[PDB]
């Protein structure tokens, strides 16, 4: 808990046009989707986009429909 962090991804559906929760931030979706959801909806990973540009990374989201 204090030594290791713990994150949880929200159902891609919710963020991909479905009654999403609050943990899911509309301005930052790619941040709440695991490599699976990331690779399926963005074809990238939190560790890939984490370094890539903020617009280019977004470029894909809008292209797939995430953001």
From Swiss-Prot:
Impact after mutating residue 29 to K: Strongly increased affinity for F-actin
Parts forming coiled coils: none
Tissue specificity statement from the Swiss-Prot or TrEMBL entry: Expressed in many tissues. Most abundant in muscle, bone marrow, thyroid gland and salivary gland. Isoform 1 (archvillin) is muscle specific.
Domain HP: 4-67
Intracellular or extracellular location(s): Cell membrane; Cytoplasm, Cytoskeleton; Cell projection, Invadopodium; Cell projection, Podosome
Superkingdom of origin organism: Eukaryota
Disease as annotated in the protein's UniProt record: Myopathy, myofibrillar, 10: A form of myofibrillar myopathy, a group of chronic neuromuscular disorders characterized at ultrastructural level by disintegration of the sarcomeric Z disk and myofibrils, and replacement of the normal myofibrillar markings by small dense granules, or larger hyaline masses, or amorphous material. MFM10 is an autosomal recessive disorder characterized by muscle pain, cramping, exercise fatigue, and progressive muscle rigidity.
Domain notes for this protein: As opposed to other villin-type headpiece domains, supervillin HP (SVHP) doesn't bind F-actin due to the absence of a conformationally flexible region (V-loop).
The protein's assembly and partners: Associates with F-actin. Interacts with NEB. Interacts with MYH9. Interacts with MYLK. Interacts with TASOR.
Family per similarity comment: Belongs to the villin/gelsolin family.
Protein's UniProt name: Supervillin
Native species: Homo sapiens (Human)
Residues of the full protein shown: 2149 to 2214 of 2214
């Amino acid at each position: 808990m204090l030594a290791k962090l713990c994150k949880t991804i929200y159902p891609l559906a919710d963020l991909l046009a479905r009654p999403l929760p609050e943990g899911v931030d509309p301005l930052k979706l790619e941040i709440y989707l695991t490599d699976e959801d990331f690779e399926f909806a963005l074809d990238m990973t939190r560790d890939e986009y984490n370094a890539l540009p903020a617009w280019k990374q977004v470029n894909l989201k809008k292209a797939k429909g995430l953001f």
